[PDB]
Every structure is written in structure tokens, then in C-alpha cells.
Amino acid sequence: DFPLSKEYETCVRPRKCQPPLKCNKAQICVDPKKGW
């Protein structure tokens, strides 16, 4: 359906982070596992 991405980038409604990521509020998605 959607392209989606990993780490800091975006995670809107239609863009639900597949992997175990964590957003903030401005749609970014991230985690201590990989990124920061």
C-alpha cells in the first residue's frame, strides 16, 4: 500500500512503521537500537 521507511523519516497514519520503531509527534520514528 505505502512505501514506508526505517529510522528517522516519517510515520503518518498510512505510514505505520513496520519494524520496532518509535515516533515522537512530528512523524519521524526512531529507536536506540539503530539511529539516535
Q: What is the C-alpha to C-alpha distance for residues 19 and 35, in angstroms, rounded to an integer?
A: 13
User: Looking at the 3D structure of the chain, how many domains does it have?
Assistant: 1
Question: What's the domain range around 22?
Answer: 1-36
What one-letter code names the amino acid at 24?
A: N
The grid coordinates of residue 29 equal 520514528
In terms of C-beta density within 10 A (0-12 exposed, 13-18 middle, 19 or more buried), how is residue 29 classed?
Answer: buried
Residue 25 near residue 5 (C-beta atoms within 8 A)? no
Assign residue 24 a region (left: φ > 0; alpha: ψ between -120 and 50; beta: otherwise): alpha
Q: Hey, what amino acid is at 1? A: D
Question: Rounded to 5 degrees, what are φ and ψ at 5?
Answer: -150, 180
**14/35 Cα distance (integer angstroms):** 22
Way the structure was solved: NMR
